[PDB]
Amino acid sequence: SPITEMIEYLPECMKVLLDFCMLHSTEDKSCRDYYIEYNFKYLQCPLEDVIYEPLTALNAMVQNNRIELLNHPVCKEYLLMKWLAYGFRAHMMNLGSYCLGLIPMTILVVNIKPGMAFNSTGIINILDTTNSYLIKTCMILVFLSSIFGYCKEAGQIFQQKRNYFMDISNVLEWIIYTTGIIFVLPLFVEIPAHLQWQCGAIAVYFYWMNFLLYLQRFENCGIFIVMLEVILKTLLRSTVVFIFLLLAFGLSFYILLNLQDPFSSPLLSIIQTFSMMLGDINYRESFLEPYLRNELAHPVLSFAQLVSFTIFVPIVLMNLLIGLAVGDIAEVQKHASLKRIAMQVELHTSLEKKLPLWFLRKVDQKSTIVYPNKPRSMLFHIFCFLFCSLEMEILKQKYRLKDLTFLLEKQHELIKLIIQKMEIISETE
Amino acid sequence: NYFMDISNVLEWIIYTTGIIFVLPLFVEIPAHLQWQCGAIAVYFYWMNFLLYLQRFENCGIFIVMLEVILKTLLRSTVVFIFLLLAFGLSFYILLNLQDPFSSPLLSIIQTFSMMLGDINYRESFLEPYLRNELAHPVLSFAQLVSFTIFVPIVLMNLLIGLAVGDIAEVQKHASLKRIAMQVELHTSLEKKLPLWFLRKVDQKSTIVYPNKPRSMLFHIFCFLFCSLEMEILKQKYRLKDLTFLLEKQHELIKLIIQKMEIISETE
Numbered sequence: 001s002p003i004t005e006m007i008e009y010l011p012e013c014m015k016v017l018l019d020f021c022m023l024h025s026t027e028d029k030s031c032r033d034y035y036i037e038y039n040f041k042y043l044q045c046p047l048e049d050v051i052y053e054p055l056t057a058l059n060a061m062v063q064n065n066r067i068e069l070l071n072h073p074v075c076k077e078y079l080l081m082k083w084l085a086y087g088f089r090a091h092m093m094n095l096g097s098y099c100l101g102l103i104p105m106t107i108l109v110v111n112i113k114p115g116m117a118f119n120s121t122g123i124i125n126i127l128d129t130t131n132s133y134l135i136k137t138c139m140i141l142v143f144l145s146s147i148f149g150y151c152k153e154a155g156q157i158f159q160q161k162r163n164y165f166m167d168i169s170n171v172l173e174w175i176i177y178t179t180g181i182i183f184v185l186p187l188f189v190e191i192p193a194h195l196q197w198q199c200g201a202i203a204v205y206f207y208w209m210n211f212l213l214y215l216q217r218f219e220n221c222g223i224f225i226v227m228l229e230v231i232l233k234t235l236l237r238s239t240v241v242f243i244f245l246l247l248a249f250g251l252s253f254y255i256l257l258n259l260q261d262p263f264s265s266p267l268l269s270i271i272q273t274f275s276m277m278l279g280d281i282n283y284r285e286s287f288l289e290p291y292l293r294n295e296l297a298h299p300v301l302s303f304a305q306l307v308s309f310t311i312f313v314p315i316v317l318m319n320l321l322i323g324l325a326v327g328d329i330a331e332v333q334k335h336a337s338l339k340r341i342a343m344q345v346e347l348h349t350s351l352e353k354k355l356p357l358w359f360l361r362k363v364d365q366k367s368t369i370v371y372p373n374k375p376r377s378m379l380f381h382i383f384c385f386l387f388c389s390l391e392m393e394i395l396k397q398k399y400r401l402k403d404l405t406f407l408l409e410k411q412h413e414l415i416k417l418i419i420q421k422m423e424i425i426s427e428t429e
Numbered sequence: 430n431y432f433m434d435i436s437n438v439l440e441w442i443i444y445t446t447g448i449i450f451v452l453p454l455f456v457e458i459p460a461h462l463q464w465q466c467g468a469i470a471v472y473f474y475w476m477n478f479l480l481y482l483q484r485f486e487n488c489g490i491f492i493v494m495l496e497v498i499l500k501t502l503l504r505s506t507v508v509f510i511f512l513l514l515a516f517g518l519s520f521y522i523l524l525n526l527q528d529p530f531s532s533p534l535l536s537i538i539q540t541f542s543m544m545l546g547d548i549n550y551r552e553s554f555l556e557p558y559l560r561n562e563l564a565h566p567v568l569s570f571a572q573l574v575s576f577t578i579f580v581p582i583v584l585m586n587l588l589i590g591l592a593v594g595d596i597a598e599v600q601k602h603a604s605l606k607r608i609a610m611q612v613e614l615h616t617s618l619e620k621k622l623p624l625w626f627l628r629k630v631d632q633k634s635t636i637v638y639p640n641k642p643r644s645m646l647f648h649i650f651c652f653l654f655c656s657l658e659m660e661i662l663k664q665k666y667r668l669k670d671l672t673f674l675l676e677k678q679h680e681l682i683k684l685i686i687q688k689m690e691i692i693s694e695t696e
């Protein structure tokens with residue numbers, strides 16, 4: 001299609017073409033009745049036996065890195081119309097389906113004291129029925145949300161066909177739903193309180209850790225999560241150097257400092273050196289005051305181990321992590337403004353494939369009218385409250401020089417023809 | 430139009446709170462409310478004086494960098510809230526018998542204090558474990574190692590990288606920003622002056638003596654005070670002139686062949 005070819009090859013002509021789809025009313029910004037009109041006849045499907053994915057021109061602009069065309073106001077109003085059509089509704093539905101399981105477990109935690117067992121009748125201590133209705137409704141909501149998650153994931157097992165294995169969000173959801181089921185089960189089957197609160201800890205922790213993955217779809221929140229992913233994978237890659245260096249210092253401090261309680265076991269010494277990584281060395285408690293009481297076996301080697309540990313782990317390794325973090329964040333923020341709109345257009349073109357086609361005909365609109373002086377009204381007010389080039393130059397240079405040398409070659413051939421056909425009298429010999 | 434401005438809000442807080450701090454010369458007020466207002470009044474006076482420091486040249490760029498990093502932290506605060514709420518509710522569950530985690534809100538504030546690296550490993554994790562006072566000890570040490578990996582190492586270095594990027598972005602254009610703020614200050618202050626004063630104080634030419642230092646007031650003021658794109662563009666202009674002249678020359682040579690006389694070279 002010619003629009004995709006203009007996006008791929010000559011984007012400035014596509015900008016000129018998009019400039020025609022901006023109809024100004026009277027060129028007076030002070031007028032309350034002033035408006036502008038956006039037409040979307042070039043952004044639509046090329047048909048309007050092969051099939052096309054939705055948002056053809058937008059995917060072509062994203063895949064060709066034409067970020068100056070994504071920031072064009074026709075494209076911005078096209079994404080805004082596409083959002084207010086169905087995307088906000090589907091996104092709030094998807095978020096509420098998880099938040100319906102998120103909220104009552106947090107209420108159930110912050111009301112009931114940990115350690116105690118509780119049925120649907122109340123808190124077993126002797127028992128009370130003060131807020132038993134709220135506890136019962138919260139356990140019913142968490143149980144129904146968990147079995148709905150089981151049904152959805154059991155559908156996605158047969159839908160994915162052994163392709164969901166290399167995904168951490170599915171693993172987190174299995175942990176959340178199983179652990180919340182075991183936390184809720186004392187309304188049916190009696191379970192001791194130790195296992196119940198052991199599961200309540202893990203369930204609340206992984207609920208609020210998994211909600212960050214639902215935060216990826218926003219524009220003002222996704223880039224922090226992307227940077228978090230990059231730095232966490234880099235730490236994952238450095239963990240073996242972490243393990244061997246920390247194991248060196250842990251076994252060494254297990255040997256030299258044996259009589260002290262923080263280094264009694266080798267595993268406790270490993271965890272103590274991991275706590276000492278950040279700089280909480282405890283110099284006076286572990287090294288100085290045992291030395292002044294003659295309680296250090298091998299004191300000279302102990303202070304040498306202290307100065308070697310303080311040089312290696314909290315200074316060198318931590319600044320290595322800081323430098324890796326600065327490099328990775330600079331790498332991500334080099335391409336952030338394209339990444340935001342790319343995630344938005346990927347969200348819209350992934351959600352639009354599953355919608356029914358009559359709904360897609362009914363909600364679609366080919367042109368919009370914006371009044372700049374009149375603010376949008378209630379729901380839109382609440383939404384506004386909650387919301388708050390040298391390579392191509394040398395390439396053109398090279399094209400013009402190639403045209404120049406072609407014309408000069410033709411001219412040289414014509415001059416040789418002149419010498420071949422010229423008449424020479426009184427200049428011979 | 431003054432609604433979307435934080436300096437006006439700070440000034441409302443300062444003047445109301447200072448009025449309530451001063452009022453016991455007129456109307457008797459208990460000392461609790463009086464010193465409660467004195468705290469807030471002194472704090473916001475000295476926080477607001479930084480905004481008055483923006484108009485200097487040697488001081489404004491630090492305030493601009495402070496604005497940029499503080500707005501970036503404002504943008505990251507929701508990830509802060511959810512991550513810290515995860516760890517706060519978790520340590521409220523597993524560490525219940527200890528005084529720093531008695532309430533859920535106290536556990537939230539304790540994890541916020543543990544953000545920087547003041548973990549208190551020996552007081553909260555080790556010595557209760559050696560006295561058999563930890564319910565769920567294995568899960569507690571797993572929560573400890575997970576917290577120490579996530580919050581003080583990963584999130585703080587994320588803040589450091591964002592800070593380095595923002596400060597590099599600001600100091601890329603600092604020398605223009607200083608003189609731009611100065612000329613904006615002068616062109617904003619000059620609009621409100623009376624025009625006869627602007628005629629009287631203006632001067633069309635100055636004389637500077639480099640060898641003689643300026644005198645007293647000026648001495649106290651001196652004591653208190655202490656390109657490849659255009660090249661290729663010109664390249665492109667010269668090449669366009671070159672190809673225009675060569676086009677004219679080619680047309681002249683075709684005219685030569687059109688008007689040339691050929692004898693004894695035909696056929």
Ligand SMILES: CCCCCCCC/C=C\CCCCCCCC(=O)O[C@H](COC(=O)CCCCCCCCCCCCCCC)COP(=O)([O-])OCC[N+](C)(C)C
Binds near residue numbers: 169242270568575
């Ligand atoms: C002595 C000891 C020394 C040891 C040193 C060890 C040092 C090693 C340190 C760290 C390595 C371990 C990191 C594990 C996860 C990293 C990969 C990952 O999730 O990235 C990506 C998302 O991730 C993100 O970008 C968001 C981040 C939020 C996820 C947090 C949950 C983790 C809780 C665990 C805590 C367990 C503790 C439990 C205890 C009770 C997922 O990968 P992807 O497929 O690219 O993206 C798909 C994303 N969608 C499409 C699915 C949405």
Ligand SMILES: CCCCCCCC/C=C\CCCCCCCC(=O)O[C@H](COC(=O)CCCCCCCCCCCCCCC)COP(=O)([O-])OCC[N+](C)(C)C
Binds near residue numbers: 483
């Ligand atoms: C568990 C908890 C977890 C929570 C995590 C939370 C993390 C979130 C962290 C931070 C977000 C909160 C930041 C609030 C202000 C940021 C915007 C701002 O002022 O920037 C700009 C100026 O600002 C500057 O550049 C100078 C900076 C000085 C101002 C300090 C006063 C703040 C005192 C509050 C303390 C309250 C405490 C009181 C208690 C007693 C103003 O914006 P502007 O209009 O662009 O510029 C106009 C400037 N002129 C023209 C007017 C001059």
